[PDB]
Design a binder for these strands. Structure first.
Ligand SMILES: [Mg+2]
Ligand SMILES: [Mg+2]
Ligand SMILES: [Mg+2]
Ligand SMILES: [Mg+2]
Ligand SMILES: [Mg+2]
Ligand SMILES: [Mg+2]
Ligand SMILES: [Mg+2]
Ligand SMILES: [Mg+2]
Ligand SMILES: [Mg+2]
Ligand SMILES: [Mg+2]
Ligand SMILES: [Mg+2]
Ligand SMILES: [Mg+2]
Ligand SMILES: [Mg+2]
Ligand SMILES: [Mg+2]
Ligand SMILES: [Mg+2]
Ligand SMILES: [Mg+2]
Ligand SMILES: [Mg+2]
Ligand SMILES: [Zn+2]
Lengths: 126, 49, 79, 59, 136, 192
RNA sequence: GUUACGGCGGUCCAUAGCGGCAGGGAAACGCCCGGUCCCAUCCCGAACCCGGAAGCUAAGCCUGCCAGCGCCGAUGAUACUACCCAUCCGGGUGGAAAAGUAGGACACCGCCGAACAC
RNA sequence: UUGCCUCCUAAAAUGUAACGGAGGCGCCCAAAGGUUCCCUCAACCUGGACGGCAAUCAGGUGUUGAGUGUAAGUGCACAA
RNA sequence: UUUCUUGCCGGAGGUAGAGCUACUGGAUGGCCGAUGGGCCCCACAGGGUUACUGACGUCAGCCAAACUCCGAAUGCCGGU
């Protein structure tokens, strides 16, 4: 008859991320001309989407789930670098050069910064 | 009186560029802050005259 | 005897200045208010005194977003 | 259909909207009569001045 | 006398004597009650007078509810004063009574004595009133 | 227990609104709505004398068979609007019911019996909420206080219900409170 | 294309919530293992961050089912009301609540990505 | 009593009188300003050396009843 | 003809009314029982009882210019 008494850490973490993602979104919005680059970061993987918030539509996406990234031999930062390059290539094919980076409610640094820097290096303007 | 009017002058050219107020009991020392100086055309240290 | 009252301040002429469907120029004041009874929406700015004003020309549109009442500017079609 | 509208009462003491609705119907004197089409616009004018006019239906 | 312990606003506009009572129009505690048929300000002194009249008639073995509390202040200026110089000081406490409002309720075993007691109270009130029962 | 429907003639209203309703009442008819699980509101007029007589005989929750354009419909008196001053019925809400349907109804609790001589019986609930069959609704429930002494508190759970009748009001509701009769001293303090 | 799937959005933002009962782990989401490295604690690798994959669906998350508490809610009637009749009260035409009732409801819609099918 | 600010009167745009009903101001802050990032009160329940209704600690319930330098009102938990 | 009038369409509102377990205050009667108070065991401790007192909670009936979960009719702004 086990009944948990409080909130598990995963519950607290999930809703706190959502909270501070919403906080960031008060100022960061995407358009067809300048899409929002949204990042989701798990322990295992990292995902990015280009979103136009006027339509609520995703223009391009990339993730560490792809076999091309799973083959990378480095650490999680190395996979983040690959995802950064893939999203820049797919966005430039979609006709986009300027984006606004949405850190998704995570601290800017580590894997997030490595993806953003790889995207900048491959010529996304942000 | 308690909050007297003070004039901030540029440390470089000494033009009296700004006027503001401070509590002289909370800040007995002469106020020193960086402000844009028109004559110099750049931010410079300014000090209470 | 005498009253301790007899005091009041000037009327501040607050309120909605441009109602639904009115065409406005950019910069035009839409509402005068004390707090955010109305929130800025699309192409509406909020002044330091919480005045709402147009950031682009168009028609004034009132709407609700997450319960907050909002003022919006919708672009008018060019002739 | 048509409505014959005859002014029965004076405009003295009548409010602005009443006086102007009579002008809009084309009535300017007691016992004058106008012929108007029975549409929504005409009904609204009559409703404003119903105490000042007599309405008869034609056709 | 019934007086409120405190009021947020001690000088108030007169209560408006318009409209039929929308609330408190039925007997809810006793078996008999007094229903108002007219608008009045009923003062705490009238309520006291009426309640004591009911008590004296039944002597004992009954319960009287007062459905109305005089929490509305009416002011008065000092005597022989000219108009102006501020609003007067509070002097009377009244209940804003509307037709249909049940003012008093009584429970008593004997109908004849109950009705007589309520009649004694009605003669103390500034208004016209009738006796009403819980029944339809 | 089984109640027979009382017949009332009803006609569909030609016009609705306060003007039409006031005229109907002036001509001695009461406006009513009939609405149902079938979700099909009908606007009716009833004769004021006949409807009032039914309510006098069988109480507020009378079961009626309405005759609407020759079609008989079973209905229950759901609610009554009674003018606070004139005591006339302004309007009636009638609920369509089929036989054997459970209906939640509020019934009148009557008090019967000689309390012990130094006692006053105070009734705190005029009414209790009940589930019953459309035709089994008791027009009045009686509680006996014939013997109870001061301090006793008849609650809703202690009242006899016929077969089929279920209690929806929670059992803790006081229906009757029996108290020792107030002295003249207590009358003088009460309400001072 | 179909899924007890993962994200990002939307709704004049609860008909979507709170709660109860049962169930789910393919890839994902998660707890989880561990501080050598960027980084971190007004103390604490709890959190934030980084490096991992031994364990587990017990929680979060997700799916099905309950109207218990919240929430939405008519029709009709009334209150109120604009204008007009009306020597005192009232009435007519038009508009029309709040509360309550019947009842609704354990959300719905868009884009992208998984995994599997073709 | 005389200028300024807030509320009610004021009749659901604005404005609206009286020696009508209530209060406040003639400042304060070098951060209590700018920006970036993070966080969520009050109250209540339970446990704990001094320690009590209430100090600091721990768990739970809690969507806003706390807090916004300073009157009041309009706002602000997305936080202001 | 930009004015006005009438029909229709787009708007903001907090009055009338109403409601309050939706807030801030006022407030009637039940029920329940912290809290003091009396008394019996008698130690001042732990407890058992009383024509006292009644928080908090709950059931039902209510009230407000400066109460509002609600909320018209008119009026007002614009378009046609
Ligand atoms: Mg300092
Ligand atoms: Mg003002
Ligand atoms: Mg500012
Ligand atoms: Mg400023
Ligand atoms: Mg005249
Ligand atoms: Mg009421
Ligand atoms: Mg798996
Ligand atoms: Mg750890
Ligand atoms: Mg489980
Ligand atoms: Mg309706
Ligand atoms: Mg309603
Ligand atoms: Mg105004
Ligand atoms: Mg007005
Ligand atoms: Mg004037
Ligand atoms: Mg509105
Ligand atoms: Mg009122
Ligand atoms: Mg009000
Ligand atoms: Zn200089």
């Amino acid at each position: 008859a086990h009944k948990p008494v409080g909130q598990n850490i995963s519950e607290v973490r999930r809703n706190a991320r959502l909270r501070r993602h919403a906080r960031l979104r008060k100022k960061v919005a995407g358009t067809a001309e300048v899409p929002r680059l949204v990042v989701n970061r798990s322990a295992r993987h990292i995902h990015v989407q280009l979103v136009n918030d006027l339509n609520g539509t995703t223009l391009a996406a990339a993730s560490s789930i792809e076999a091309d990234v799973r083959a990378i031999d480095g650490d999680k930062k190395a996979h983040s670098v690959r995802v950064g390059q893939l999203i820049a290539e797919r966005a430039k094919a979609a006709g986009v050069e300027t984006v606004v980076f949405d850190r998704g409610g995570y601290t800017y640094g580590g894997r997030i910064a490595a993806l953003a820097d790889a995207a900048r290096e491959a010529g996304l303007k942000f | 009186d308690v909050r007297p009017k003070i004039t901030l002058a540029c440390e470089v050219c000494k033009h009296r560029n700004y006027i503001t107020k401070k509590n002289r009991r909370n800040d007995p020392d002469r106020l020193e802050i960086k402000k844009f100086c028109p004559n110099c055309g750049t931010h410079q240290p300014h000090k209470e005259s | 005897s005498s009253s301790r009252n007899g005091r009041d301040s000037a009327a501040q002429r607050l309120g909605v200045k441009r109602f639904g469907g009115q065409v406005v120029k950019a910069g035009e004041i839409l509402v005068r208010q004390r707090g955010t009874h109305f929130h800025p929406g699309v192409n509406v700015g909020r002044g330091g005194d919480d005045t709402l004003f147009a950031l682009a020309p168009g028609a004034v549109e009132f709407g609700a977003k997450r319960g907050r009442k909002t003022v919006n500017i919708v672009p008018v079609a060019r002739p | 259909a048509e409505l014959k509208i005859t002014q029965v009462r004076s405009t003295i003491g009548a409010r602005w909207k009443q006086r102007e609705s009579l002008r809009t119907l084309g009535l300017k004197k007691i016992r004058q009569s106008v012929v108007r089409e029975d549409n929504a616009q005409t009904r609204g004018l009559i409703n404003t001045v119903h105490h000042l006019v007599e309405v008869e239906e034609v056709g | 006398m019934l007086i409120p312990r405190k009021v947020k606003h001690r000088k108030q506009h007169h209560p408006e004597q318009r409209g039929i009572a929308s609330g408190g129009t039925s007997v809810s505690f006793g078996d008999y009650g007094i229903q108002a048929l007219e608008h009045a300000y009923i003062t705490n002194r009238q309520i006291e007078s009426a309640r004591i009249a009911i008590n004296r008639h039944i002597k004992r073995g009954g319960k009287v509810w007062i459905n109305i509390f005089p929490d509305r202040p009416l002011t008065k200026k000092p005597a022989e004063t000219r108009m102006g110089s501020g609003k007067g000081s509070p002097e009377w406490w009244v209940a804003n009574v509307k037709p249909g409002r049940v003012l008093f309720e009584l429970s008593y075993p004997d109908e004849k004595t109950a009705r007589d007691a309520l009649t004694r109270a009605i003669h103390k009130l500034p208004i016209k009133a009738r006796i009403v029962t819980r029944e339809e | 227990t089984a109640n027979i429907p009382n017949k009332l003639t009803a006609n569909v209203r030609t016009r609705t609104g306060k003007g039409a309703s006031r005229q109907a009442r002036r001509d001695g008819k009461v406006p009513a709505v009939l609405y149902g699980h079938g979700t099909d509101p009908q606007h009716l007029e009833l004769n004021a004398r006949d409807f009032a007589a039914v309510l006098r005989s069988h109480g507020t929750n009378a079961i009626l068979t309405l005759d609407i354009e020759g079609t008989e419909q079973l209905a229950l008196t759901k609610a009554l609007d009674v003018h606070p001053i004139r005591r006339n019925i302004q309007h009636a809400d009638l609920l369509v019911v089929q036989r054997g349907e459970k209906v939640t109804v509020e019934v009148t609790v009557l008090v019967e019996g000689d309390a012990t001589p130094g006692t006053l019986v105070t009734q705190d609930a005029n009414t209790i909420e009940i589930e019953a069959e459309a035709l089994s609704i008791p027009e009045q429930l009686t509680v006996s206080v014939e013997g109870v002494e001061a301090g006793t508190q008849i609650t809703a759970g202690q009242i006899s219900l016929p077969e089929g009748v279920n209690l929806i009001s929670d059992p803790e509701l006081l229906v009757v409170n029996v108290v020792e009769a107030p002295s003249a001293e207590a009358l003088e303090e009460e309400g001072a």
